[PDB]
Design a protein around this ligand. Structure first.
Ligand code: ZM1
Ligand code: ZM1
Ligand code: CL
Ligand code: CL
Lengths: 222, 222
C-alpha cells in the first residue's frame, strides 16, 4: 500500500524537454533521495526504467489518445495490460463516466481485479459524484487528478476556495483520497495533508523545470 | 551581455541523480521555454551540450576540487581553458581572497582578458570586501554565490535580514550584481530584482528535483 506522504509524478510526454524513460528514472531517484514515498509515472517503459532505479511503489498510467473518446488516462484494457506487464503497484485510470473507446469503467475495474488481483487501483476523478462512484467500485485510492482537466470542470483548480473541492471529496468518501493536480508549493502540500488526504502527488512543482521557471518569471510580470 | 531577468543554473555534479550533459541540456531547454534569459552550467561537456540546445548566454564554471585549496569554482587556468574551449559568453570563478591551487585570482583575471578578450567574467564572492576587490579587478558581474559557503561566512544566507548582504553588495560596487545563492522561491526572486540586482541565478529550486522534494517533505517534519 502507499504510505502517507509525498508521491512525485515523474512524467514527460513526447516533445516535453525531459521526455525519456531514462531521465524519468533519474527524476524518480532524485525524488527517492529527497524523501518521496512513491512515484507516479506514465507508460510501461517509463515505469520499468523507474523500477530499475528505485523500489518506491509506482502509480502507473498510460496516457494514450483514442479517436471518439476524451478519456486518455488508461482508456482501455490495452493500457491496463501494459501496466500489468509494468508491475506498477497501483494502476490509475480516468474514473469519469465519459465515453470510453472499449470497456466501461466497471469493466476495467473488474478486468484489473481479475487479471492483477495484487495491484491496487486509483480513480482519477473531476467531481465529488465521480469520487463517490469510485468508492462504490472499491477503488483503493481516489485522486483529484482530473478536477480542472475535463470539459465540465474548466477553470476549477484544486486549491480554489481553500481546497473546498478536496474538503467535499474527503467528506463524501471513506476511501483513501489523494490530493493530485495543482499541488504547487510545500504550503499547499501541508494544507492537503492537514485536511486528511492519505498522500499527495506533486508533479510539475518538482519534475517540470519549464513550469517552475514560468512561476519564477511570472512573479516579475504581475 | 546578460539581460535582466532569470538565469537558470542547470548543474548536476557526479554524485547527483541528474549528472549528464544531455539531461542538463534539457533542463536548459526547459528553462528557455519557461522564459529564462540565461543559463549557468558546469563543465565544458555540459556547456557545449547546452549551447547546441539553446542560444541563451551561458555563465560557465568548472567545479573541480584541488588539494590544499578551498577554491573549487574555476580554480586554475586548466578550468579557464576548458571554459574558453566551451565558448560560454561569461566565465564565472570563485573570486574569494582564498589561496588558489595555482594562479592567483588576479593572475586568472589577466589570463582571461588576454586569452578570451570577448568573454565577460563573473566574480562568485562571499563578502562585501571580495565584491569591492572584484570591482577593482574589473569583473563584468559580481554574484553573491559563495556568501554562506566559506569558512569566514558560516551561518550567513543571502536572504537573512531582508537580503541585507545583497543591499550591502549593491551599495558597495557599480558593477552589475547577480543574486545567486539560496534564491529558492519566486518571492525571493522578486525581492532581489526589486532591490536592483541586474539578474538572479536560480538553480536547485528549478533543476534539482531532490532539493525541491526535500522542501516539500520538510514542511511535514517541522
Ligand atoms: C490531468 C492530467 O493529465 N494530470 C496528470 C496525471 O498524471 C499530471 O498532471 C499529474 O497529476 C501530475 C500532478 O499534477 P501537477 O503537475 O502536480 O499539477
Ligand atoms: C556555493 C556553490 O557551490 N553554489 C553553486 C554555484 O554554481 C550553486 O548554488 C549556484 O550558485 C546555483 C545557485 O544556487 P541555488 O541552487 O539556486 O540555491
Ligand atoms: Cl519541463
Ligand atoms: Cl536533484
Amino acid at each position: 500500500m502507499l504510505p502517507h506522504g509525498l508521491i512525485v509524478s515523474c512524467q514527460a510526454l513526447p516533445d516535453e524537454p525531459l521526455h525519456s524513460s531514462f531521465i524519468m528514472s533519474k527524476m524518480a531517484l532524485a525524488a527517492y533521495e529527497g524523501g518521496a514515498v512513491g512515484i507516479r509515472a506514465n507508460t510501461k517503459e517509463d515505469i520499468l526504467a523507474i523500477k530499475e532505479t528505485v523500489d518506491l511503489p509506482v502509480i502507473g498510467i498510460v496516457k494514450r489518445d483514442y479517436d471518439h473518446s476524451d478519456v486518455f488516462i488508461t482508456a482501455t484494457s490495452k493500457e491496463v495490460d501494459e501496466l500489468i506487464e509494468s508491475q506498477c503497484e497501483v494502476i490509475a485510470l480516468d474514473a469519469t463516466l465519459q465515453q470510453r473507446p472499449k470497456e466501461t469503467l466497471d469493466e476495467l475495474v473488474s478486468y484489473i481485479r481479475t487479471h492483477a488481483p495484487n495491484v491496487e487501483i486509483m480513480a482519477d476523478i473531476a467531481t465529488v459524484e465521480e469520487a463517490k462512484n469510485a468508492a462504490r467500485l472499491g477503488f483503493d485510492y481516489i485522486g483529484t487528478t482530473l478536477h480542472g482537466y475535463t470539459s465540465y470542470t474548466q477553470g476549477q483548480l484544486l486549491y480554489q476556495n481553500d481546497f473546498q473541492f478536496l474538503k467535499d471529496v474527503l467528506q463524501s468518501v471513506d476511501a483513501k483520497v489523494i490530493a493530485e493536480g495543482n499541488v504547487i508549493t510545500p504550503d499547499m502540500y501541508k494544507r492537503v495533508m492537514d485536511l486528511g488526504v492519505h498522500c499527495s502527488v506533486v508533479g510539475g512543482a518538482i519534475t517540470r523545470p519549464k513550469e517552475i521557471t514560468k512561476r519564477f518569471v511570472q512573479i516579475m510580470e504581475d
